[PDB]
C-alpha cells in the first residue's frame, strides 16, 4: 500500500478554501423553535384547538424572539400542514434615541440591534396571560391567551420602568400575583409592580462601590461552580401561592440562596481591555479549598388590599445551615411544592456521593435581629415540631449526577408527600421512581439545647415503586425532563431503551407500571416537549444523513383501551433543510472491547477514496464525562470541519471511550480516581479495530485533536502512546487537576489528599519529561481570557516543558474565553489547524521532515 | 554559486552540541575586579606605597566580595608583577543556624550560600577606615586603612543589629560621622548607630499593611522610570558635613526624594508563583500619562555630645516643588557641595530638552506643620534672599542624555560656584566645560505674594571654558566618569577621540586647556579607574581577539615638564584568559552610507568556508539608542552564540545603524519622532555592501534576530522588507509605543499628541496587515513576567495578527522577566533559535518548504 499525501495548499489558498466552504453555511447559526407552551383556545365555533408559543430565530443574522402558531382541530391527511410563524412581539425600536440622524446613520444602526435585543427565555401566568421576558437591558411584558383573549397581530412589549442604575438580570413573574415581578440588580433581589410602578430592594447584601476583596456576599444568584458544574443559574424562587392577611391584603414570599465567597480563593484572569494591562479579580474554588458559605433566606413581603407594600421582613434559618443540613456543601436545586406549603431543595455533600431531598417549612425562618435578647425570644416562639424534613436520601460509590426531574403531586394526606424522582443509585441506570414519604415529627427537640444527630430529620419511606427498569437510562439533563398526566395517571419521558445512539419519547403508567410505549419513530434521535394538557408533543429530531427537523404529533388512544397510547403526525413547525451539498455523513461503527463493553465510534472515509492507498488519520476526541459524541444525530453543522478534513484526504475517527454519557453510571464511573489512565487505551483499541478492518488507515501518520477534556486527552495520548500518535493539537487543556474547580474535580477524582497518585498521574504538567524530544508533534491552543480552564494550565505545562528541555508549538487567542466567539479567531484556528496537520502529518513534506 | 545547506541536526543532537560548547565556558560568568579604591600606606620603612581595595569574583560559582592588593614602591621591570588577591572579609557563616545537622546536611547547605551572601557595592570613610556594605539581608562593617592601620588577615564583618522586620536596602555611611548609617526599610528612611546600637525611623510615609492602591507614597527610593530609564537607584543623600550645636552636639542632615504614585496608572504583571494564578499591582507611567508627584524633603537629626538622638525634625520646601522648579518632571541626579553648604540637583522637563543644575539651600526647608497658623509663621521667618539658584541651564532640539559627570570645586568666593560638567548641547558631542556661576540674590521676593517668573532663579554665567572639543565624545555613563587632580589642575576622562570603536583614557589641563594626551595603548578598548591621588590608574581592556584584562599603570612626568603626563605598566590585577579555543573573532568592517555617515559592522565568516558556495545569513540586531554593538572589545563571552551560528555554516552580520551610541547627538537624533522608519534601510544598505564585496552571502536566505529594540526592528524588518528577510525572530519586542513608559518613549518620540503619525507608523501592532501571509517567517519570543516590555506588546500584536489572518510562531518563558536568568530557559531559547533557523532558513528542508 503506497501512502496518500494531501495536496499542499499555501496559507492564503487554505484561507480561501475554508471561506468558500463556510459561505453557504450562514442559515446554520440560527436557533430552532424551543421553550414551547400550549394554550387552549376554548372556542367551539373556531377552527383551532390550541395556540402554541415558542422562542425561535426567523433566519440568519436575526433576533431570538417570541412566535406563535395555530393548532387546527382537524387536518387534511392527504397534504402536509406547515404551521406559519406569527410574531407575538412588535419591533422593539430602542427608546431614548431622539437626536436627528438620517437614512445613512439609521440603516447602519439597525445592524447593531441584532445580537442585543434577543429573548433567551420567558415567564407566563396562565390565569392572566402575562408574558415576562428580558430583551437586551429592558424587562418587558405583553398579554395573550388569558381572559383578554388571543391577538391576530404583533403586540407592543411594555417596558417595566426602573430607578436601578445597572442591568437587571433573571426576571420572574410572581405565580400568586402577576402584577409583581422580581429581578437581580448588583447581586441583590428587587421586586417591581408592572401596574403601580412600585420598586423595592429586598436584600442589602452587596455594595457595588466596595472592592470584591471586601464585598464577597450576593443574594438570589448562583456562584461560579453552580452555574458551570451543576447547570443552575437562578438563586431565588417565588412561593407559588399568597397568604391572605386579616387586613384583606396578602403576604408574598421569595426563598433565596445567600452566598458569602469571603474564604473562597481569589484568582486574576486578564482583563478583555488588553490596553489597560489589568486583570479582573474572580472567586474560583480550586479543588481541595473552601466553597462559598451558603444558607437559605426568605423575604416576607406584606402587600395591602390596594397592592401597595406595607412592610418587607427579611428572615434567616432558626439555626445555622451547617447544623440543620449536616454535611451539605451544594444547593444543587430548589423550589416550592405546588400549594407553596413547603420549600424543597436537592442537597449534596462535598464528595457528591450523598443526595438529599429536603422539605423546608417557611416556619423555620425568623426575622433577622442583631439584638441577641430579641433574637433568643424569636427562636423560642417557634415550636420544636417545626423541623427540616428529609423526604429522600440516596448514596453511590461512583457519584450523584444532578438532573431536572422532580414532580411533586398535590398533597392529599396531611403527614404524607407523593413525588416522582429519577436515580442511578439503585440499578446503576437513571430510572423513574414514585416515592411516598411520611412527614414524621422529629425525635430531635430544639428546646433541649443539644445539636441534632446525623439522621433525626430523615422521613420513613412508606412506598418506592420503580416506574422504569433495564440496561438503559431516562434523560433528565440539558432540556430532557418528564411530563406527568395526573388525569390518565401516565408519565411521558425521554430515554435510550431502543438504542444508546437514539433519544426516544416513551409513556408509562406510574400507578401500575408495566409495558413502556415508544412514541417516536426509530431511525432518528429525538428532543421532545409534551403539552401541559398531554394531548400533543413536539419533536426536534435528526439522524446522520438528515438535518434537524421540528414536527407536532397529536396523542390519542384506541376507543376500546385508553391505556394504549398512539401518535399521529399533525403538522411541521420547522422543515428540515434536507441533505446538505458537499457534506458526506460518517458511518457509525462499534467493536467488542476487551473491557467487556461495546464502544461506539464514527468513521469519515477519505472523499474520492483511491484503491490500494493508505491515508493519514486525525482522531477527533473529547472522551470526558457528561458528553456523547457518537449517536444518530446530524453532525454536518457542529462537526462540519471533520467532513472538510475528509475532503482534503484525511481518515477522521471519533470514539466514545469509557467515561462517556448515556451508557449508565458503571460505564461512566470506569475512570473514578483514574482520569487520563484508561481513555487512550479505548481510543487505540478502536483505532486498531478500524485499521485491521480497513486497509486505507495509515497508522504511521495518526493525529489527535480535542478541546477542554479533548485537549487534555490529546496531551495524555502523545505522552502515553507516542508510538501511535505522531502529532497532538491540545485546545484549552486541563494540565493540572489541583488548579480545576471543586464541583467537577472532586466529583470524579475525590479530595486531593485521598487520591495523591490519581491527581499526579492524571496531571500532564507533572509528567513533562514523558513528552517527545521531537518538535512538530505537540501544539497547544488556548484562549487567553478563559474563565473555566485558565491559561495557567498551558503556562504551567510550558514552564515544565522548558525545564525538561522539550519542544512545543503554541497559538494564543488573546480576546477569547473557553468557547471562541469572535469569527476572526475561529477562522484563524481552523486555518492554523489544517495547515499544521498538512505540514506535520498529511503532506509528503511531513514524511520527509522526520 | 551553489547554495550551502547547514547540517540538519535532531532537537536532541542540537541540545548536546550546545551543552558541549557551553561546558568550558563556566569561568566566563565571573565578575572582573571593580569599585577600586587607593589608600596610601604612609610607611617610609615599608615596601608598599598604596593598598587597593576592590569587589571581585575569585572564580566560577563564587561570591562577589571585597579583596585588597599591595602596590609596591618599586618593580623589577625585567619581570611582570601579578598582584595577589587578599580577601578583606572572613567567611560570613549565616548566624542563627543552631539545629544539629551533619556533614550530609551541611556540605549541601554551603551550595545555597553562594548567590545570597554577595556584595554589589560598599561605602568607605577615609578618616576612620570604616567599610559599610549590604551582604545578602545583613548590613555589615569592618575597618582598614584608617588610624587603626592595615590588617594582614581577613577581618570578621560586624552585623549592624536591627529591630526592622523586613530586608534593609541601600545602606550609606554618614560622611560627617561614621558611627551613623542610613538605610531604606519598607519605602521609608531609617538611621542606625553601629556603636550605640540606637535605631530610629526618619520617615512615616509608607504603611506595609495597607494596599498599594491606597498607599502610593515612598521616601529615599527612586521610582520605576528613574531606575529603568535614568540609571538612578538611590533617593536620599547624607550632608557630608555636620553643624556643631551650642550644646556641644551636632545636626546631621539627609536630603531625600519623596514620591507620590497615586495618579500613576496601575498595571498587573503575572505573579511569579504561577500556581496562585494571581497578578502583582505595579505603578507604570505609560507614555502620555502622569509621572509620580516628586518633591525634596530634608531630615534634620539633632545628636548630643554623647552621640544619642535629641530630636528628629522632618522639613518640606517653603513653597511647592512645582512653583520653585517650574516645568521640572524628573529629578535625574542629586547630591551635596563638598562643604555641604548647598544641596545640588540635575532637573529635567517632561520633553527632556531642558536640563537645569540647581543649588538648594537647607534654609529653603521648614518643619512639616498641619496647623496653617504655625505654618504661615515658619514661611515668614525665612528671608526672601534664600531662594533656589539655577547655576546652569541648557537646551537641545534632540534630547538631554543624562550622565554621572559633575565635579564641584571648593567654594573660594562667597557669591561664586566653580564646577566641571559635560554637555552635547553646544557642539552635538559630549565635551567637558569648566563653568563659574554668580550666586545673585533673586529679583523675586516671596513676601510680595506673587508666583515667580520662569527665569527669576537663573544665575549669570561669569565664565564657560571648553576643556575638550572635536568630532568625538567624553564618556559619562555606565561607569565612565572623570577624576579631577585639583593640585596639578588636570582632569582625567574617557573618550572616543582616537576611534569610535575604542574607549581611551585622556588627561588635559582645565585652567589652560590645550593638547589632550591619550594614556591608554591603541589596539584595545579601555574601561579605566583613576586613583583619588592621581598617581595611578587601572584599565579593564579587551580587543576582538583577546579576552578582558585588568592592569595597573603608574603616572609621572618628565623632570623638565610636569605638564607632560606619561604612564608605566606597574602590575597585572586580572590576567587575560588568552585566545579562547573554538571561538573565531569577527572582522570589523565599515561602508560610506548614502546618509552621509560611516556605519560600522561585524562580519562572522562561516567556519571551514567552502569555495564557490553561498551561505545563509543571520543578521543579529539591537539598533536602538544608548547601545553600540560594534567596537574593538572581546565578543566571545556575551555574543559567543553568534560564533556557534558561524560554526554551523551561517554568515552572521551586526550593523550599528543611525541612532546607535558613541557617534554624537546628531547621529543619535537621526530617528527622533521616526523610530522604526530609518533603522532597516541602514541594515539593508550594510547587508548589500557585504553581498557585493563577498560572494558567499546568500541574500535569498537572510534571517534577522534581536531582543527589546532588536525584537522590535526584527518585526519592522519582516514588515517593511519581506523581499530581503525570509525569517524574523523577535524577542520581548516593543509592538506599541503608547504602552511603553514616559522616560524612554517621550525622550525619543515626544508626547503622543504632537507625534500621532510617528507613534502609528512606529508601532508594528497597528500594521499587522503588512506582515507576510506565509508561515515559518515570524517567531515571537517573550518572558511572561517581563516588567520592562510587558507581555501585552506580544498579546496585542497577536490579537491584530489573528484579525488580519496572518500566521505566527510563539515561545513563552513563563518564569522569566526581560533578561532570562534561570539556565533551563536560556538553554531552551538557544536550542529553539538554532532549530528554527535550521528548519526555516539554514537547511535544504527550509528551501524545499517554500
Ligand atoms: C472541558 O471538557 C470542561 C470545561 C469546559 C471540563 C474540563 C467541560 O466540558 N465541562 C463541562 C461542565 C459541565 C457540563 C458539561 C457538558 N456539556 C458540555 C457542552 N455540551 C454541548 C453539552 C454538555 C461539560
Ligand atoms: C530594549 O531595548 C529596552 C528595554 C529593556 C528599550 C525598549 C532597553 O534596552 N532599554 C534601555 C534603557 C536604559 C538603558 C539602556 C542601555 N543599556 C542596555 C544594557 N547594556 C548592557 C548597557 C546599556 C537600555
Ligand atoms: Cl396521583
Ligand atoms: Cl581650581
The answer to whether residues A665 and A658 touch, using CB atoms and an 8 Å cutoff, is: no
Residues ≥6 apart with Cβ < 8 Å to A415 = A438, A439, A440
DSSP-assigned beta bridge partners for residue A311: A302
Residues ≥6 apart with Cβ < 8 Å to B828 = A802, A805, B811, B813
Helix (H, G, I), strand (E, B) or coil at B11: helix
Q: Which three cell numbers stand for residue A792?
A: 495557567
The greatest distance separating any two alpha carbons of chain B, rounded to the nearest whole angstrom, comes to 91
Q: Which three cell numbers stand for residue A38?
A: 400550549
Chain breaks in chain B (C to N over 2.5 A) after: none
**Exposed (0-12), middle (13-18) or buried (19+): which is A577, by Cβ within 10 Å?**
middle
Phi/psi at A794 (nearest 5 deg)? -65, -55
Nearest of A178, A305, A161 to residue A244 by alpha carbon: A305
CA distance A328 to chain B (A): 27
Q: Which of A799, A839, A849 comes nearest B815 by C-beta?
A: A799
Looking up cell 592601620 gives B149
Quick one: which H or E segment has residue B704?
strand B697-707
Instruction: Please state, in angstroms and rounded to a whole number, the distance separating the CA atoms of residues B517 and B527.
Output: 17
| Subunit contact A278:B266, Cβ cutoff 8 A | yes
| Residue nearest to ligand 1 atom 15, measured at CA | A626
Instruction: Please state, in angstroms and rounded to a whole number, the distance separating the CA atoms of residues A577 and A582.
Output: 14
Instruction: Please state, in angstroms and rounded to a whole number, the distance separating the CA atoms of residues A468 and A475.
Output: 12
Nearest of B580, B345, B332, B326 to residue B444 by alpha carbon: B326
Q: Which residues line ligand 2 (CB under 6 A)?
A: B 229, 478, 624, 626-627, 708-709, 734, 744, 788-789, 818
Distance B824 CA to ligand 2 centre (A): 24
Instruction: Please state, in angstroms and rounded to a whole number, the distance separating the CA atoms of residues A670 and A396.
Output: 14
Looking up cell 551636632 gives B250
**Exposed (0-12), middle (13-18) or buried (19+): which is A389, by Cβ within 10 Å?**
buried
Q: Which three cell numbers stand for residue A670?
A: 470506569
Q: Which of B798, B810, B824 comes nearest A802 by C-beta?
A: B824
The answer to whether residues A783 and A813 touch, using CB atoms and an 8 Å cutoff, is: yes
CB contacts under 8 A, B 286-345 vs A, are none
| Subunit contact B832:A807, Cβ cutoff 8 A | yes
Helices and strands, number each (H, E), in chain A: 13, 46
Instruction: Please state, in angstroms and rounded to a whole number, the distance separating the CA atoms of residues B247 and B701.
Output: 81
Catalytic residue among B407, B705, B818, B835: B818
Instruction: Please state, in angstroms and rounded to a whole number, the distance separating the CA atoms of residues B504 and B420.
Output: 20
A519-to-A468, A494, A505, A507, A532 alpha-carbon distances in Å: 16, 10, 5, 7, 17
Q: Which residues line ligand 1 (CB under 6 A)?
A: A 229, 478, 624, 626-627, 708-709, 734, 744, 788-789, 818
Sign of the dihedral defined by the CA atoms of residues A489, A493, A496, A498, in that order? positive
Does A805 contact chain B (CB < 8 Å)?
yes
Nearest of B412, B420, B446 to residue B341 by alpha carbon: B412
Contacts of A12 in chain B (CB under 8 A): 773
The gap from C-alpha A88 to its chain's centroid, in whole angstroms, comes to 27
For an interface test with B, which of A211, A812, A846 has the most B Cβ atoms less than 10 Å from its Cβ? A812
CB atoms within 10 A of CB A822: 14
Instruction: Please state, in angstroms and rounded to a whole number, the distance separating the CA atoms of residues A782 and A809.
Output: 12
The greatest distance separating any two alpha carbons of chain A, rounded to the nearest whole angstrom, comes to 91
CB contacts under 8 A, A 727-746 vs B, are 739
Nearest of A734, A800, A737, A729 to residue A770 by alpha carbon: A800
Radius of gyration (C-alpha) of chain A in whole angstroms:
29
Instruction: Please state, in angstroms and rounded to a whole number, the distance separating the CA atoms of residues B344 and B392.
Output: 11
The answer to whether residues B805 and A16 touch, using CB atoms and an 8 Å cutoff, is: no
Helix (H, G, I), strand (E, B) or coil at A607: coil
Quick one: which H or E segment has residue B762?
helix B756-762
Looking up cell 547547605 gives B109
| Subunit contact B12:A832, Cβ cutoff 8 A | no
- Told to judge if A351 belongs to the known catalytic residues of this protein, a careful annotator would answer no
| Subunit contact A279:B277, Cβ cutoff 8 A | no
The answer to whether residues A771 and A718 touch, using CB atoms and an 8 Å cutoff, is: yes
The answer to whether residues A755 and A242 touch, using CB atoms and an 8 Å cutoff, is: no
Written as one string, the DSSP assignment of B262-330 is TTSPEEEEEPS-GGG--EEEEE--BTTSPPPEEEEEEEEEEE-TTS-EEEEEEEEESS-HHHHTTT--E
Sign of the dihedral defined by the CA atoms of residues B42, B44, B46, B49, in that order? positive
Q: Which three cell numbers stand for residue B267?
A: 498595571
Helix (H, G, I), strand (E, B) or coil at A649: coil
Q: Which three cell numbers stand for residue B703?
A: 534571517
Quick one: which H or E segment has residue B837?
helix B823-837
Distance B483 CA to ligand 4 centre (A): 13
For an interface test with A, which of B213, B771, B802 has the most A Cβ atoms less than 10 Å from its Cβ? B802
- Told to judge if B843 belongs to the known catalytic residues of this protein, a careful annotator would answer no
Quick one: which H or E segment has residue B12?
helix B11-22
Catalytic residue among A786, A790, A793, A843: A786
Written as one string, the DSSP assignment of A129-148 is TEEEEEETTEEEEEE-SSTT
Instruction: Please state, in angstroms and rounded to a whole number, the distance separating the CA atoms of residues A88 and A157.
Output: 9
Nearest of A172, B497, A635 to residue B506 by alpha carbon: B497
Mutate to test the pocket of ligand 2, among B227, B402, B709 (most ligand atoms within 8 A of CB): B709
Phi/psi at A554 (nearest 5 deg)? -85, 135
| Subunit contact A802:B825, Cβ cutoff 8 A | yes
Does A266 contact chain B (CB < 8 Å)?
yes
Q: What is the 3-state secondary structure (H, E, C) of A688-721?
A: HHHHHHCCCEEEEEEEEEEECHHHHHHHHHHHHC
Q: Read off the DSSP letter of residue B766.
A: G
Interface size A-B, in CB pairs within 8 Å, comes to 117
Quick one: which H or E segment has residue A376?
helix A372-381
Ramachandran area for residue B772 (φ above 0: left; ψ -120 to 50: alpha; else beta): beta
Instruction: Please state, in angstroms and rounded to a whole number, the distance separating the CA atoms of residues A697 and A652.
Output: 10
| Residue nearest to ligand 1 atom 4, measured at CA | A708
Written as one string, the DSSP assignment of B574-640 is E----S-TT-PPPEEEEEE-TTSSEEEEEEEPPSS--TTEEEEEEEE---STT----SSS--TTTTH
C-alpha triplet B352, B353, B359: angle, nearest 5°: 80
Distance A626 CA to ligand 1 centre (A): 7
Task: Count how many Cα atoms sit within 13 Å of the Cα of residue A348 in the half-sphere of its side chain.
Answer: 23
The answer to whether residues B340 and B241 touch, using CB atoms and an 8 Å cutoff, is: yes
Angle between helices A679-693 and A709-720 (to 10 degrees): 70
Quick one: which H or E segment has residue A668?
helix A665-668
Nearest of A568, A521, A574, A569 to residue A543 by alpha carbon: A521
Strand pairing category for B536-542 and B525-530: antiparallel
Q: Which of B773, B835, B849 comes nearest A12 by C-beta?
A: B773
DSSP-assigned beta bridge partners for residue B756: none
The gap from C-alpha B45 to its chain's centroid, in whole angstroms, comes to 43
The sheet with strand A461-466 has its strands ordered as: A406-408, A416-423, A431-438, A461-466
User: What CATH number is given to the structural domain containing A253?
Assistant: 2.140.10.30
CB atoms within 10 A of CB A209: 6
Instruction: Please state, in angstroms and rounded to a whole number, the distance separating the CA atoms of residues B701 and B850.
Output: 11
Residues ≥6 apart with Cβ < 8 Å to A848 = B845, B848
The gap from C-alpha B211 to its chain's centroid, in whole angstroms, comes to 31
Instruction: Please state, in angstroms and rounded to a whole number, the distance separating the CA atoms of residues A115 and B824.
Output: 48
Radius of gyration (C-alpha) of chain B in whole angstroms:
29
Instruction: Please state, in angstroms and rounded to a whole number, the distance separating the CA atoms of residues A620 and A298.
Output: 49
Contacts of B11 in chain A (CB under 8 A): 773-775, 807
Helix (H, G, I), strand (E, B) or coil at B160: coil
For chain A, the first-to-last Cα distance in angstroms comes to 20
Nearest of B200, B189, B196 to residue B238 by alpha carbon: B189
CA distance B291 to chain A (A): 17
The gap from C-alpha B487 to its chain's centroid, in whole angstroms, comes to 31
The answer to whether residues A315 and A368 touch, using CB atoms and an 8 Å cutoff, is: yes
CA distance A840 to chain B (A): 12
Please, which experimental method was used?
X-ray
Instruction: Please state, in angstroms and rounded to a whole number, the distance separating the CA atoms of residues A789 and A735.
Output: 9
The answer to whether residues A333 and A345 touch, using CB atoms and an 8 Å cutoff, is: yes
Instruction: Please state, in angstroms and rounded to a whole number, the distance separating the CA atoms of residues A585 and A602.
Output: 9
Distance A478 CA to ligand 1 centre (A): 11
DSSP-assigned beta bridge partners for residue B742: none
Can you list the positions of beta strands (E) in B136-198? 138-143, 158-159, 169-173, 180-185, 188-193
Ligand 2 atom at minimal distance to the Cα of residue B477 = 23
Instruction: Please state, in angstroms and rounded to a whole number, the distance separating the CA atoms of residues B698 and B833.
Output: 20
Q: Which three cell numbers stand for residue B638?
A: 556575551
| Subunit contact A814:B796, Cβ cutoff 8 A | yes
The answer to whether residues B414 and B483 touch, using CB atoms and an 8 Å cutoff, is: no
The answer to whether residues B348 and B332 touch, using CB atoms and an 8 Å cutoff, is: yes
Instruction: Please state, in angstroms and rounded to a whole number, the distance separating the CA atoms of residues A516 and A467.
Output: 9
Distance B535 CA to ligand 4 centre (A): 18
How would you label A247-277 residue by residue, b for 16+ Cβ within 10 Å and e otherwise?
A: eebbbbbbbbbbbebeebbebbbbeeebeeb
- Told to judge if B125 belongs to the known catalytic residues of this protein, a careful annotator would answer no
| Residue nearest to ligand 1 atom 9, measured at CA | A708
Number of residues that make up chain B: 850
Nearest of B403, B459, B399 to residue B432 by alpha carbon: B403
Q: Read off the DSSP letter of residue A367.
A: E
CB contacts under 8 A, A 823-842 vs B, are 824-825, 827-828, 831-832, 835, 839
Quick one: which H or E segment has residue B69?
strand B65-72
The answer to whether residues A85 and A184 touch, using CB atoms and an 8 Å cutoff, is: no
The gap from C-alpha A810 to its chain's centroid, in whole angstroms, comes to 31
| Residue nearest to ligand 1 atom 12, measured at CA | A229
B259-to-B320, B345, B578 alpha-carbon distances in Å: 14, 16, 49
Q: Read off the DSSP letter of residue A842.
A: I
The answer to whether residues A654 and A601 touch, using CB atoms and an 8 Å cutoff, is: yes
Mutate to test the pocket of ligand 1, among A225, A404, A480, A626 (most ligand atoms within 8 A of CB): A626
Sign of the dihedral defined by the CA atoms of residues B433, B438, B440, B443, in that order? negative
Instruction: Please state, in angstroms and rounded to a whole number, the distance separating the CA atoms of residues A141 and A159.
Output: 7
Residues ≥6 apart with Cβ < 8 Å to B532 = B37, B38, B483
CB atoms within 10 A of CB A540: 22
Written as one string, the DSSP assignment of B443-510 is S--TTT-PPPPTTSSBPPEEEEEES--SSS-B--STT--EEEETTTTEEEEEE-SS-TT--EEEEEES
Q: Which three cell numbers stand for residue B629?
A: 554593538
Q: Which of B278, B812, B827 comes nearest A805 by C-beta?
A: B827
The gap from C-alpha B301 to its chain's centroid, in whole angstroms, comes to 32
Number of residues that make up chain A: 850
Catalytic residue among A69, A345, A525, A708: A708
Helix (H, G, I), strand (E, B) or coil at B539: strand
Distance A709 CA to ligand 1 centre (A): 8
Q: Which ligand is nearest to the CA of A487?
A: 3
A591-to-A217, A619, A697, B295 alpha-carbon distances in Å: 52, 17, 17, 79
Residues ≥6 apart with Cβ < 8 Å to A403 = A422, A430, A476, A477, A480
Phi/psi at B841 (nearest 5 deg)? -150, -60
Instruction: Please state, in angstroms and rounded to a whole number, the distance separating the CA atoms of residues A745 and B526.
Output: 63
Residues ≥6 apart with Cβ < 8 Å to B321 = B294, B295, B296, B328
Instruction: Please state, in angstroms and rounded to a whole number, the distance separating the CA atoms of residues A799 and A793.
Output: 10
Written as one string, the DSSP assignment of A199-230 is EEE------TTS-TTT--EEEEE--HHHHHHH
Residues ≥6 apart with Cβ < 8 Å to B99 = none
Strand pairing category for A158-159 and A169-173: unpaired
Does B847 contact chain A (CB < 8 Å)?
no
Instruction: Please state, in angstroms and rounded to a whole number, the distance separating the CA atoms of residues A650 and A842.
Output: 7
Range list of H helices, B637-750? 640-648, 665-668, 679-693, 709-720, 742-749
Chain B residue with CA closest to A801: the answer is B828
Nearest of A421, A356, A342 to residue A393 by alpha carbon: A356
Q: Which three cell numbers stand for residue B156?
A: 570578621
Catalytic residue among B708, B714, B763, B843: B708
Q: Which ligand is nearest to the CA of B407?
A: 4
C-alpha torsion angle, residues B74, B77, B79, B83 (rounded to 10): 40
Amino acid at each position: 500500500l503506497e501512502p496518500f499525501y494531501v495536496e499542499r495548499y499555501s496559507w492564503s489558498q487554505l484561507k480561501k478554501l475554508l471561506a468558500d466552504t463556510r459561505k453557504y453555511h450562514g442559515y446554520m447559526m440560527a436557533k430552532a423553535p424551543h421553550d414551547f407552551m400550549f394554550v387552549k383556545r376554548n372556542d367551539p365555533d373556531g377552527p383551532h384547538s390550541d395556540r402554541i408559543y415558542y422562542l425561535a430565530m426567523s433566519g440568519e443574522n436575526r433576533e431570538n424572539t417570541l412566535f406563535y402558531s395555530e393548532i387546527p382541530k382537524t387536518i387534511n391527511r392527504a397534504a402536509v400542514l406547515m404551521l406559519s410563524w406569527k410574531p407575538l412581539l412588535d419591533l422593539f425600536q430602542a427608546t431614548l434615541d431622539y437626536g436627528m440622524y438620517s437614512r445613512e446613520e439609521e440603516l447602519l444602526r439597525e445592524r447593531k440591534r441584532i445580537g442585543t435585543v434577543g429573548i433567551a427565555s420567558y415567564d407566563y401566568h396562565q390565569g392572566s396571560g402575562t408574558f415576562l421576558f428580558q430583551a437586551g437591558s429592558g424587562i418587558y411584558h405583553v398579554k395573550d391567551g388569558g381572559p383578554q383573549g388571543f391577538t391576530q397581530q404583533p403586540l407592543r412589549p411594555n417596558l417595566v420602568e426602573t430607578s436601578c442604575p445597572n442591568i437587571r438580570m433573571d426576571p420572574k413573574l410572581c405565580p400568586a400575583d402577576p402584577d409583581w415581578i422580581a429581578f437581580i440588580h448588583s447581586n441583590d433581589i428587587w421586586i417591581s409592580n408592572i401596574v403601580t410602578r412600585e420598586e423595592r430592594r429586598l436584600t442589602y447584601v452587596h455594595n457595588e462601590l466596595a472592592n470584591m476583596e471586601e464585598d464577597a456576599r450576593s443574594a438570589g444568584v448562583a456562584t461560579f461552580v453552580l452555574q458551570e458544574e451543576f447547570d443552575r443559574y437562578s438563586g431565588y424562587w417565588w412561593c407559588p401561592k399568597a397568604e391572605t392577611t386579616p387586613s384583606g391584603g396578602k403576604i408574598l414570599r421569595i426563598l433565596y440562596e445567600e452566598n458569602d465567597e469571603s474564604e473562597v480563593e481569589i484568582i486574576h484572569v486578564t482583563s478583555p481591555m488588553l490596553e489597560t494591562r489589568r486583570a479582573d479579580s474572580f472567586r474560583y474554588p480550586k479543588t481541595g479549598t473552601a466553597n462559598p458559605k451558603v444558607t437559605f433566606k426568605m423575604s416576607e413581603i406584606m402587600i395591602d388590599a390596594e397592592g401597595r407594600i406595607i412592610d418587607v421582613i427579611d428572615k434567616e434559618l432558626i439555626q445555622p445551615f451547617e447544623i440543620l443540613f449536616e454535611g451539605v456543601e451544594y444547593i444543587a436545586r430548589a423550589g416550592w411544592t405546588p400549594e407553596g406549603k413547603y420549600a424543597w431543595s436537592i442537597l449534596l455533600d462535598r464528595s457528591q456521593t450523598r443526595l438529599q431531598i429536603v422539605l423546608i417549612s417557611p416556619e423555620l425562618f425568623i426575622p433577622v435581629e442583631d439584638d441577641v435578647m430579641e433574637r433568643q425570644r424569636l427562636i423560642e416562639s417557634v415550636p420544636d415540631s417545626v423541623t427540616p424534613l428529609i423526604i429522600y436520601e440516596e448514596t453511590t460509590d461512583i457519584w450523584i449526577n444532578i438532573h431536572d426531574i422532580f414532580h411533586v403531586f398535590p398533597q392529599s394526606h396531611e403527614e404524607e408527600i407523593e413525588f416522582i424522582f429519577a436515580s442511578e443509585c439503585k440499578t446503576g441506570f437513571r430510572h423513574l421512581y414514585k416515592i411516598t414519604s411520611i412527614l414524621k415529627e422529629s425525635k430531635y427537640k430544639r428546646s433541649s439545647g443539644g445539636l441534632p444527630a446525623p439522621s433525626d430529620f430523615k422521613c420513613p419511606i412508606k412506598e418506592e415503586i420503580a416506574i422504569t427498569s433495564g440496561e438503559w437510562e431516562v434523560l433528565g439533563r440539558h432540556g430532557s425532563n418528564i411530563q406527568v398526566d395526573e388525569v390518565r395517571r401516565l408519565v411521558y419521558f425521554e430515554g435510550t431503551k431502543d438504542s444508546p445512539l437514539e433519544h426516544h419519547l416513551y409513556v408509562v403508567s406510574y400507578v401500575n407500571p408495566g409495558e413502556v410505549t415508544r412514541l417516536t419513530d426509530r431511525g432518528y434521535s429525538h428532543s421532545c416537549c409534551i403539552s401541559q394538557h398531554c394531548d400533543f408533543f413536539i419533536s426536534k429530531y435528526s439522524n446522520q444523513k438528515n438535518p434537524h427537523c421540528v414536527s407536532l404529533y397529536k396523542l390519542s388512544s384506541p376507543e376500546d383501551d385508553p391505556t394504549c397510547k398512539t401518535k399521529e403526525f399533525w403538522a411541521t413547525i420547522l422543515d428540515s433543510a434536507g441533505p446538505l451539498p458537499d457534506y458526506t455523513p460518517p458511518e457509525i461503527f462499534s467493536f467488542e472491547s476487551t473491557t467487556g463493553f461495546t464502544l461506539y465510534g464514527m468513521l469519515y472515509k477519505p472523499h474520492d477514496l483511491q484503491p490500494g492507498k493508505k491515508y493519514p488519520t486525525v482522531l477527533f476526541i473529547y472522551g470526558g464525562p457528561q458528553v456523547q459524541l457518537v449517536n444518530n444525530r446530524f453532525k454536518g453543522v457542529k462537526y462540519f470541519r471533520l467532513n472538510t478534513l475528509a475532503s482534503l484526504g484525511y481518515v477522521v475517527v471519533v470514539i466514545d471511550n469509557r467515561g462517556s454519557c448515556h451508557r449508565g453510571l458503571k460505564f461512566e464511573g470506569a475512570f473514578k480516581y483514574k482520569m487520563g489512565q484508561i481513555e487512550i487505551d479505548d481510543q487505540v483499541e478502536g483505532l486498531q479495530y478500524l485499521a485491521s478492518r480497513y486497509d486505507f488507515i495509515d497508522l504511521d501518520r495518526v493525529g489527535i485533536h480535542g478541546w477542554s477534556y479533548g485537549g487534555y486527552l490529546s496531551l495524555m495520548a502523545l505522552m502515553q502512546r507516542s508510538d501511535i500518535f505522531r502529532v497532538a493539537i491540545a485546545g484549552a487543556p486541563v494540565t493540572l487537576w489541583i488548579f480545576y474547580d471543586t464541583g467537577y474535580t472532586e466529583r470524579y477524582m475525590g479530595h486531593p489528599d485521598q487520591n495523591e497518585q490519581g491527581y499526579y498521574l492524571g496531571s500532564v504538567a507533572m509528567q513533562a519529561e514523558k513528552f517527545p524530544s521531537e518538535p512538530n508533534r505537540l501544539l497547544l491552543l488556548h484562549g487567553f481570557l478563559d474563565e473555566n480552564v485558565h491559561f495557567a494550565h498551558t503556562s504551567i505545562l510550558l514552564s515544565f516543558l522548558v525545564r525538561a528541555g522539550k519542544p512545543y508549538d503554541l497559538q494564543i487567542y488573546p480576546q477569547e474565553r473557553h468557547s471562541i466567539r469572535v469569527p476572526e479567531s475561529g477562522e484563524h484556528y481552523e486555518l492554523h489547524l489544517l495547515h499544521y496537520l498538512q505540514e506535520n502529518l498529511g503532506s509528503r513534506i511531513a514524511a520527509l521532515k522526520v
